[PDB]
Amino acid sequence: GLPSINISFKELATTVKERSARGIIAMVLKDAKALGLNEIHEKEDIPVDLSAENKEYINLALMGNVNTPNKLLVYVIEGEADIQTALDFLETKEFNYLCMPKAVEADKTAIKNWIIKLRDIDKVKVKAVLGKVVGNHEGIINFTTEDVLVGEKKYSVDEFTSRVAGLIAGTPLSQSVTYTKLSDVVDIPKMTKVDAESKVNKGELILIKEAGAIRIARGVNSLTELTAEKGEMFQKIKIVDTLDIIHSDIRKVIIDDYIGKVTNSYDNKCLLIVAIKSYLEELEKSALIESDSTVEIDFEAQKSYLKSKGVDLSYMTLQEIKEANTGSKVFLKAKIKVLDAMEDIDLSIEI
């Protein structure tokens, strides 16, 4: 059939568990030394030229949760530099969560728009942990807890996003961060429970004092506008992470191995679909998703494409529409159910 595509899906299925348990974090830092990109897998890879402040943010991220973050991409830019430059740079780098400990309001707006663009236009499923940003979008995690006391130092809400990003990256796909305890935090500002429940339902990720310890109140992103196809499940950090790794894996094989290398006929689209479903069957075995995932030609997306090309669909059967030539375009629809979730999720894949 399509040997090169089956090989690629077989490799990714073999590592999806590992890659899910230990994510990658992009961190933009303001500093005068060690400019550019710094890959950091451990504390020893940290350039000694960075300020002790920046070194603390890096270490906060390495704590993780169940596991530590697989890798940190630390992009250093000079003060006064345009944030849009670090973002432009990261568009060709592989990461899961972006944070910026020293972001100002102007920076946050740029990242928010940037993240939304990558996810909904470029189809690059990345996320950001920002401080006090009403993102109303699954791609933005809105951490809002101020004056986080670790050891004998009070980190600001923006600073602590380094710890929050690492904690999420070090959490397996099968686990929530809801009520995860942060033993390194010894105090936080007093907060009425009414203010806490209100903030959560407004899309804020917060720390709370609960039964002597400090823990994450609920692992939610900033999404508050819900639809029939994008409902409560899309507010959940762990669910979005599951959808993102699956979408990324499928889109990567299609882009790397199919587009332009395989004739994009209906018969080859069917072979591709079968290959994608075989990958999903592997994820089903690995306990990421429930059984009975489906993948099909995205009928409404392909219909819209044909209409944009002036194709008249009035003589055409449903099968003829599915089989129609779409040049180098691929329109697929995947129906998956993440483990223990209450509803199926439709995943649109378009190249």
Author numbering: 4 to 354
Give excerpts from the publication.
The R-type diffocin sheath protein CD1363 crystallized in space group C121 with one molecule in the asymmetric unit. Therefore, SAD data were collected from a crystal obtained from SeMet-labeled CD1363 protein. Because crystals of the labeled protein diffracted to higher resolution, the structure was refined against these data and the subsequent discussion refers to SeMet-labeled CD1363. In the crystal form discussed here, CD1363 is monomeric and comprises two domains. The domain arrangement is best described as a “Russian doll” system in which domain II (residues G26–S225; domain numbering according to Leiman and Shneider, 2012) is an insertion into domain I (residues G4–R25 and residues L226–I354). At the N-terminus, residues P6–A25 form a long α-helix that closely interacts with α-helices α9 and α10, which flank the central antiparallel three-stranded β-sheet. The larger domain II is composed of a central six-stranded β-sheet and five smaller β-strands flanked by four and two α-helices, respectively. Similar mesh-like organizations have been found in several T6SSs, indicating that these interactions are likewise conserved in assembled R-type PTLBs. Interestingly, the C-terminus in monomeric CD1363 also forms a β-strand (β14) that hydrophobically interacts with residues of α9 and α10 as well as with the same residues from the neighboring β-strand (β13 in CD1363) as observed in the pyocin particle, albeit within the same chain.
